[PDB]
Amino acid sequence: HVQLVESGGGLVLPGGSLRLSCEASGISFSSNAVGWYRQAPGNQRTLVAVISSGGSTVYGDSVRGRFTISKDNPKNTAYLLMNNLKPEDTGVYYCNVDRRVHALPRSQSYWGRGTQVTVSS
Amino acid sequence: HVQLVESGGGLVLPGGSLRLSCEASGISFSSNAVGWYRQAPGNQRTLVAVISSGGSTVYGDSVRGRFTISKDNPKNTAYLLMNNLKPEDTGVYYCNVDRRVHALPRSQSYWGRGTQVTVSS
Amino acid sequence: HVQLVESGGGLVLPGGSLRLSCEASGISFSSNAVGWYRQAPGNQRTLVAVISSGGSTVYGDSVRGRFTISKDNPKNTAYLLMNNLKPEDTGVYYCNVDRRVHALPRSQSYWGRGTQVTVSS
Amino acid sequence: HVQLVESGGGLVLPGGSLRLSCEASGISFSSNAVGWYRQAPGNQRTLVAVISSGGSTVYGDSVRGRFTISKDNPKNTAYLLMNNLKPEDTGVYYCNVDRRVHALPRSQSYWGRGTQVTVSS
Amino acid sequence: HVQLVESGGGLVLPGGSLRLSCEASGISFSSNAVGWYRQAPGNQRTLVAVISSGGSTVYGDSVRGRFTISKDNPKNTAYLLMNNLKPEDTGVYYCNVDRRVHALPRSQSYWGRGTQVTVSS
Amino acid sequence: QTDMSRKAFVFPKESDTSYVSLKAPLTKPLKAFTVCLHFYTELSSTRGYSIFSYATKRQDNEILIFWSKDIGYSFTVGGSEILFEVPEVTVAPVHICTSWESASGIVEFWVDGKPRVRKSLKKGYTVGAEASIILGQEQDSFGGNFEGSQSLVGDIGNVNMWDFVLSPDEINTIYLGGPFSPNVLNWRALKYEVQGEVFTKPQLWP
Amino acid sequence: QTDMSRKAFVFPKESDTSYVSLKAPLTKPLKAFTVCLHFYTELSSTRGYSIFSYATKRQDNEILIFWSKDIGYSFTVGGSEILFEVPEVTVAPVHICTSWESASGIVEFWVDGKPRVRKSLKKGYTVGAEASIILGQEQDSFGGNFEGSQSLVGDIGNVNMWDFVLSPDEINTIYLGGPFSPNVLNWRALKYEVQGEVFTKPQLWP
Amino acid sequence: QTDMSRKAFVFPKESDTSYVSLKAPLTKPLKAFTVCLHFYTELSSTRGYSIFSYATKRQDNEILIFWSKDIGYSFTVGGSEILFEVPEVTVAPVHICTSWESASGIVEFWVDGKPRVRKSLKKGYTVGAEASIILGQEQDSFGGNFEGSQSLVGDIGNVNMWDFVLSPDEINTIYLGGPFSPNVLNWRALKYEVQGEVFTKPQLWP
Amino acid sequence: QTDMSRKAFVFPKESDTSYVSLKAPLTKPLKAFTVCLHFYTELSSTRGYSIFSYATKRQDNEILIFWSKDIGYSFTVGGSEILFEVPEVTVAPVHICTSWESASGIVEFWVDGKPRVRKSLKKGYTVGAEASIILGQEQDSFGGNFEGSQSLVGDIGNVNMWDFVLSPDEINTIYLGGPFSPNVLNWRALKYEVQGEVFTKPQLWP
Amino acid sequence: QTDMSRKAFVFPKESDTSYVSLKAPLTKPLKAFTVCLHFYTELSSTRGYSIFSYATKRQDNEILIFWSKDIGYSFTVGGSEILFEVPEVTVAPVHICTSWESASGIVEFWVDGKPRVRKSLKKGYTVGAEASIILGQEQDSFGGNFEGSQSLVGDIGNVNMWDFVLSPDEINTIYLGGPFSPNVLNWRALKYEVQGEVFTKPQLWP
């Protein structure tokens, strides 16, 4: 069926950098859109960076021009490069895919486990 | 005479959801408007979500697009579905009915006891 | 000569109500304007609610649509109705009269002793 | 030569009043402009109230319509009236004179010792 | 090859002044632009003051009209004169050169060691 | 009858006894209607005031237009009601034109020439004939029963009403001030009674 | 008499001794009035200044127009007073026109062409005839008794006054600068005295 | 056939069963297209609504225009999608015109007359012929499978579609309301079916 | 003499040695004056710059116009000085016109056509004749003694000066660009010297 | 040669291989120049992009125009560079016209008709003749050496260049779209090569 595998996560000292990969199987990024959402109070995932099937991308308001997201159809994998992260950026991150970028996530959209990131000094 | 019965309330951990029901007797929601008000300092209830007889609804400024209110004339019952509630949302809630949506409540408008909601983690 | 008598003051629990009366003698409210001022740091009384001789009234910015001032020429008495008073509203209140509403008070304008109000819970 | 003498300063309880005088010798206020500046972090004297030779005056933004400054050519003395002074107003004050009002002071402009004001309650 | 030498730095009491010199060798300021950047959380150097080859200069938003930067081609040295510095200005400062003013620094742009400034009282 | 052209009613002070009553020759039940009027008051965001009221012998709110505080315009028919939202409030004379139909059950609400979204309300239901059109005070009964809190202080005029539904062109011509022939309430051949402190003076608005 | 056409009084500096006095041929008591004038000053939100004063032998404020600090325009007749509120203040020449009637007891206050809401004041009361119209300083008595704090520093001109009440069309024509014929105070046939530092210079405003 | 000139469809209430279907005489595959339409609704920043849908037997989103909440306009062809960003939202009737070409693979999106930056999408790919153009509800299949959350509540009209690509002058003439001749979907010779609560009424917008 | 019509001086870089000097045929003392000029610079809210200077043998600031940082325009005569306040600053060419009279002792300062409030300054005092009108740098003495901090970087032109006082109509015609005849400093028959880096180029402003 | 009238180049996607090259008949060294062009892109405050480049055999930045992120326009000649500051950014087609002279050493930069303050740059220095005018990508050498980060995504057209310096009237006529005769690079008789993904389509801007 559909399985989403996340990799490339952990903890780093402040000011470092890291890169995340959200590999997918069964589904194809050619006719879909992917995105990474953060954790927040309650059950509110916050928008971080999303790339649509066509190529247009939308970044979070706070992180405007901080990180870069990209995709590769051949191996059907999405890479998010995070650099120059402040301590507050630590938390729980998820990578999801849906038939169309939809801002605030929606029920059907697969979520894909999760990952933890620490900005400990 | 007129009796207002509230049900569906309690406490839940953060990020959960709940649904309240404000059943009425004697009065009819067909030619009236209902609404839920929160507790606040002093004797000032705050607007949360109100549905008029016609069908138009007005939600609180802070809770814009967070919960959904609805009604059912056949059984004359109004249901408010709260989801993704933060800890600050805890307090005392009331459901009232009046001949016309009037923002800040008015003297004649019934109040209908009350209920307690906790967002304890 | 001229004497101003204030009455109807004290302390109440939060959310209560009260009403103050500023009776006057010698002077006439028919050709004058009255008003209530609060206490503040230094010697700066603050605008609360003022009613002119004609009938127009001016309320404080913070108390917009909260209180209600009124007058009665027959017995020459002004009544201010306090309702929905938060704890911060406690302090020292004065009622004064002058030939014309003049915002920030003026030296000639009689002041009229004072009164204390507490919002203790 | 040129000597600047300041007088009329000290400490008063909150809400009191005082008056400062900046007498000058050698220089003439007829063809000059005077002003009082406050103390601040670093070496940043802050504008309080300045009167030009012609008669136009400029008051500080925070002090808009609070105090009054004035001058007198006959005995060549400038008086600033302190009234309704909050506790934060305490600090170090200086009175200086220059050929033309120049906002942020300038090196040539004579400074004239200084004075201390306390708003202790 | 290219070597960048910084000089004129240390610690001073509040309200003092200092001047920093960023001498260069190998590269020429005639066809380049220099600038001083501050330290910040993470790896975010912040714009302080930059002077382009032509002569136009750009100062930081917070430090608008506080310090003055200047250059001298003959000896190919850039001098930044800081005066009236508040305690918060303390930190780590760097002087760098690039072929064209580029706001947020860029990888190729040489950085030039660094320096420490203290505003201890 | 009388011609109120270039004339307007004025309510000087707020009270609960000043009001006018407009009579109509209506005899048969209504299956649709449209009303238009101009008005100007400074109440604004202070309290709610009544604009137009139309009661019957079995309903106090057969037709009613209100200004709900911080909510906006409230249009109610036969008990049911809808509320058109206005984000901000100004201070200047305003012209309004509302229309409702039975079979379609659609409500249109033009404000100052610009139209608003169409909405559905009270599908398949008739309106009575015996009516008492009071102007100045909201009524909770066929006669008086006024509430001083809901009184209006300002000026109002140019009240017209048709039984059928107008078209956008017709509404635009109405706004521009052209000719038109009402058939229910004609401002040019009005017949009215008045009680209390009400005055007639030339209209301020152009 | 003299024609002040395209002329304006100027008060250079604030003081308590500079002022002009306007005489009138009025002989019979007034049961209504209307005044119009243009003025321009920079006091704005600094302090209150007097605009127009009209005193008698038994009242210092028979008619008076003031600019209450942060409150707005204040119009007072025979002691009673009302205050028209202005949200924000600008810096430019302004034209004002106020009118009052006895029987109706309604006050109208046009500012810069646009009208304001009507209001009630002093119903059923007459105004005296023997008057001293001082311009420049507010008066607390028939003669002087001025207060320097309330003085005016700026320019004022085009002062006209009719005994009866004008109509909106007439006010619009006045604003546009058309012909007219006052009957109490005519700016084209004025008769005045002056004392202190007051100058006459061409009007800046168009 | 029928002429919908000066006519518009109206959807009173949100639901999942009201919709219209437009038929076309298309027989050969498309290598380019252009569509134009006017619409007006108050959904705005509340939820996303479907504007125009075009499905086939092997794809539910052959062509689709959507209003992604807080994101802006979303234009998708054959699965691929792009999103034109709009910073702020207003409340007034809006006219849109989009065009796409195969060989060039460029998409143009004119909104309210002003053009937006060009973008590339789906280079070298054809579009099927057998189609079901439903209006009112987004489709996830050739037939129904609608989703009530994505329904549209408002007015829409003046739907035109050409197979080739128009020029800027042609688009400007379209906006100004001049003559023209569609060849796929002509609003003047439309042929449609309707089901549910849908009404035809004169267009509000000019 | 030469005609500087459609010509303007340009100061490329800030310095303390570039400046022009304008000569006049004045022979008798002045009891009034009026000056007008256009200028355009980007200094704005960065530092104060000198606009127009007029010195004598016993006073460095006989007449001077300055732009005090965050304060506004500063007009000084014979030592005494006034300041007109400007709330906000823009970036575009600006035209100014100031006038002063001895007997009246009133100063008028028109900026960009709109007039400012009248003010009193230096009543009953004459102005010398032997003068050295330097343009570009403020002077603290009859000759040089310039200060680089107060230099001007930008463009300036259309400098005219009359001995008497103009009327509002005349100033309006000046602003609109009509004919006129100066008698002290005529831009059409100017006579000047220049030193340093100063260039003459066509005026950018219309 | 070919006439690019009412035509514009289009760069669909960002890359490091798409660009055009413009040839010129220039043979003698330049002692002054002026260029004018229109362009429209949505990059805005996201990253810096190159507008116009002009390199030689011994310098990669003989002439270059750039949009420095949050800084504004950057104009550089023969290594030296100046920056014109823009406070806010919009989204719409823009027209620019820059001019430089050797002897005077003054740079003028008209943006959308309005002029900016003049500035000095590179006094007394000539420009080479053998040049390679690449459009689309900034060059760090006579040939390629492009940087993908600095590429341009949008539309550009109406590129004209004169060897001498135009006058303000001439620039205004150019802006208004009148006749004119270039002598270095004529958009009406252009001669160009192209490589990569570049298309020619009608210009969107009027």
Describe the overall structure.
The complex is a heterodecamer, with 5 copies of chain A (121 residues) and 5 copies of chain F (206 residues). With 121 residues, chain A is an all-beta fold. In chain A, 0% of the residues lie in helices and 43% in strands. Chain F is mainly beta. Chain F has a single domain, classed as Jelly Rolls (Sandwich). In chain F, 4% of the residues lie in helices and 36% in strands. In chain F, the strands form 3 sheets. In chain F, strands 10-9-8-3-12-1-14 form a 7-stranded antiparallel beta sheet, with no helix packed on it. Chains in contact: A-B, A-E, A-H, B-C, B-F, C-D, C-G, D-E, D-I, E-J, F-G, F-H, G-I, H-J, I-J. At the A-H interface, loops of A face strand 7 and strand 10 of H. Chains F, G, H, I, J: It comes from Homo sapiens (Human). Chains F, G, H, I, J: Keywords: Acute phase, Calcium, Disulfide bond, Metal-binding, Pyrrolidone carboxylic acid, Secreted, Signal. Chains F, G, H, I, J: Belongs to the pentraxin family.
What is the fold-level CATH name, i.e. the topology of chain A?
Immunoglobulin-like
Give me the CATH architecture of chain A, please. Sandwich
* Largest sheet descriptor of chain A: 5 strands, antiparallel
Structural class of chain A: mainly beta
PDB class: immune system
Keywords: CRP, antigen antibody complex, immune system
Assembly: decameric
Entry title: CRP-HCAb2 complex
Spell out the blueprint of helices and strands:
The complex is a heterodecamer, with five copies of chain A (121 residues) and five copies of chain F (206 residues).
Chain A: E1 3-7, E2 17-25, E3 33-38, E4 46-51, E5 57-59, E6 68-72, E7 77-83, E8 91-98, E9 115-117
Antiparallel strand pairs in A: 1-2, 2-7, 3-4, 3-8, 4-5, 6-7, 8-9
Chain F: E1 8-10, E2 19-22, E3 32-41, E4 50-54, E5 63-68, E6 72-77, E7 80-85, E8 94-101, E9 106-111, E10 119-120, E11 133-135, E12 154-162, H1 168-176, E13 192-195, E14 199-201
Antiparallel strand pairs in F: 1-12, 1-14, 2-11, 2-13, 3-8, 3-12, 4-5, 5-6, 6-7, 8-9, 9-10
Family (chains F, G, H, I, J): Belongs to the pentraxin family.
GO molecular function, one term (chains F, G, H, I, J): low-density lipoprotein particle binding
Keywords (chains F, G, H, I, J): Acute phase, Calcium, Disulfide bond, Metal-binding, Pyrrolidone carboxylic acid, Secreted, Signal
